[PDB]
Design a protein around this ligand. Sequence first.
Ligand SMILES: O=P(O)(O)OC[C@H]1O[C@@H](O[C@H]2[C@H](O)[C@@H](O)[C@H](O)O[C@@H]2CO)[C@H](O)[C@@H](O)[C@@H]1O
Ligand SMILES: O=P(O)(O)OC[C@H]1O[C@@H](O)[C@H](O)[C@@H](O)[C@@H]1O
Lengths: 461, 461
Amino acid sequence: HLKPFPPEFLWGAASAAYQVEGAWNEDGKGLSVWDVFAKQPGRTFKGTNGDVAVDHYHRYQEDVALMAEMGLKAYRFSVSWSRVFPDGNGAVNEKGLDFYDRLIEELRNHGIEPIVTLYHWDVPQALMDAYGAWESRRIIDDFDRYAVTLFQRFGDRVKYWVTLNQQNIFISFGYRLGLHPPGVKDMKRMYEANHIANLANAKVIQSFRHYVPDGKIGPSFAYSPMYPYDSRPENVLAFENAEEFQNHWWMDVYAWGMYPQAAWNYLESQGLEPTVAPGDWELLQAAKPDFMGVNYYQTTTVEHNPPDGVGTSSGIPGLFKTVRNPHVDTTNWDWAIDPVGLRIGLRRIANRYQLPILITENGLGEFDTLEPGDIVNDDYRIDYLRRHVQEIQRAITDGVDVLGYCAWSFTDLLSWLNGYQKRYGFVYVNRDDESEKDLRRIKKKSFYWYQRVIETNGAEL
Amino acid sequence: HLKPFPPEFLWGAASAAYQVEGAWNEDGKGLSVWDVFAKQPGRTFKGTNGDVAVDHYHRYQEDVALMAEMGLKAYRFSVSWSRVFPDGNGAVNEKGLDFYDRLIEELRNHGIEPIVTLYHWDVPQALMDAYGAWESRRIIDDFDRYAVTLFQRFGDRVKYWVTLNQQNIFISFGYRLGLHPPGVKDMKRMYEANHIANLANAKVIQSFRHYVPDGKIGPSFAYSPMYPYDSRPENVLAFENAEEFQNHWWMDVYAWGMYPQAAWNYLESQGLEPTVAPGDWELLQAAKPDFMGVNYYQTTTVEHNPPDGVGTSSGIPGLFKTVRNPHVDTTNWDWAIDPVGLRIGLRRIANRYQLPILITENGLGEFDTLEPGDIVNDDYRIDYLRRHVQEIQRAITDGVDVLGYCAWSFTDLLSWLNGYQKRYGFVYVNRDDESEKDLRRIKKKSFYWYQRVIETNGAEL
Ligand SMILES: O=P(O)(O)OC[C@H]1O[C@@H](O[C@H]2[C@H](O)[C@@H](O)[C@H](O)O[C@@H]2CO)[C@H](O)[C@@H](O)[C@@H]1O
Ligand SMILES: O=P(O)(O)OC[C@H]1O[C@@H](O)[C@H](O)[C@@H](O)[C@@H]1O
């Protein structure tokens, strides 16, 4: 017998500021590190950038009306720090706050719960210029001041808050892979930045207990649960290594305030462990969240990787390497499609940390065709979303406390580096990589599917 | 490059009182449940029982002299409750205590650390007759009074203590499988007895913090780490269920004072969850151990098990079933041999609980041939031990705090149900299932191997 979705289950959809808003230099907004990075020649596909994106800044009333048509219970968005503090620190921009106040009012006039994301990768460029943003302890207090501003303005009306969204991605892409700002490839720097981000998350949760005492807050982690390839002992050991180094390295700090030891000793053997200050442990341990946010797309299977092995497959010599999983389907971009992996991840979080879970992001990106009569038949997206939602209900039945599900994304949006054509939305936006066209919003088949899921609280999938 | 073993590493060997002592009715000893059970005809191979065993109660001086020849750093043994309280509660038997005092002094006179194990399966029969032993809450205070007696007598001289040894074995074999006393096959009763044993363990740990404030204590768990068969999502899910149900069910209680929730909810759905009294959680949560004891022989591989499936393979329908692992070796008794599995289990306990580990038992059971000139060439036992010790060194290199390693067993001993021929000792005892012969002690080749391990602190294996 499956348990129903609970009565206040947050059936949601989500976006990120840079990906949807546009209005990059309007109303006193300052430059973000992504405004500057995306304009560097060659960094983004076809030079696409967030100057306009899908123009949600100007079109938010129409987008919220579509959310109310769907009957969304929640909408998760991020606040652009550069709209609120153009220089990161210094003077507050009231026009920037007023946008978010208007959005929040629009949502709440339509019965939709705002879920505010403090940070989605868009630190103001002035903090990078002054002190290298996330590589300086200065950002702890600067981020805290920005979060407290939002808690004071909006805490009366927003219950659910996410802090750092996918820290593991903005830190590893920014400092290890060099794919995101600041374009660094230096693992020592990455781990230092990562440690400062940890401190900044904990500081803001501490502040939130003061200013929003009836609210709920947590970080959101980009979680790819690890699988061993098989029951070969060395492959299971590779999975122990991978799960700790890729996943526990973040989530243990969020839940328990401590880094896992094996991974710490591995980094210390490489001279990569972060610099720890007095007070750091006590801060990290005293900032327990209300939930773990999870951004989920796929699992990762791993196998043994010898000390001269792989650094197709990626890994850490002597720790693990990735291997294709022969037992799941793949998307056209070679991501696994693994809905049972979402149940697995959910079970692992409850079993390890006993935390409730907000699923902050899950979705399917695909080329969608706009057919005559403004029809998009994205049954491939319905099938993927269906399967995941089915597995969530199984995890709830097992005993996981799932607070809600935010499908990625509400409208189509700009990808960070790959332009617009791999689409994620319930709502098609008429534009492409060459121009904004008319930016018209067109409901996809999946829109109506999810409207029906919500209406029936997930009895009709 | 491997780290060395730590300088104070406890190279050990172990036994259990029923399996070694004999002297079943001497010096006021009362009946244990095993004295009674093993005399039931047909229960044990060739009617073998503990009346004499290997006669360690009379031959302890010789045995300890051999330990000192080997250079053992630690000797782990169990105390027979029925020697100390013949009726379980009631009057203390000084002559019982005196045997352990004489053993302890022998150890100490030869520079060997005693590791006292409170409980190895031998509750006095009188408690079983009085109130059903582990099925009654009365045993919590009776066990505590027994423990406290030992702490008071020996706490000055014994630093390391183990509480319940292999609770998961005595409880499951006694109440689910009906292989051990009290010969019951009832899961409801099993979980209730298990709950009471958890409270007993936590009560004694609290007591220890008063009586032996500079000591180290913990329970010892019979740990078979689970592996998924492959990377099929449903097999990984089966692993999740199996690790939780078979392993976390005990070790989360020991470390955290909490049962895991998915398994709890499954048992509650079946009417199997234990009865919880006011005060039980607070007690379980306030009795943190210094270390996790681990008895290790093999890993277990699992796969998906349909709701109309297995309850050869064993399992829980809808949760998991066991499967032979084609990737590990086997003894001549078809026990799997999986040394890497020890490293995995070690890694998992440090990763989950951040506890130091005492390996309380690990060894190879095999027929040994006694050659003329009192020669026993057991290179098979050397190979098995060596491989496991090598994996412990890798675990220590990874960052696991391993306190020591107690090889199973110091002398050959009586098995619970299978007599004497599958031998585990470094020291052969000349007796068999039909005859006590002369009970003479013969050093095996493995004796000398281990001697050399200890002399070099594990650098020469
Ligand atoms: O002689 P046997 O029957 O090989 O017994 C060996 C030792 O077994 C240890 O416990 C085992 C138990 O025998 C298994 O059936 C069970 O599944 O595993 C546990 C794992 O610890 C006992 O610890 C010991 O007292 C026996 O000598
Ligand atoms: O378009 P891509 O490159 O598949 O990116 C999809 C998504 O990737 C996720 O990691 C990010 O959360 C989003 O912010 C983004 O839309």
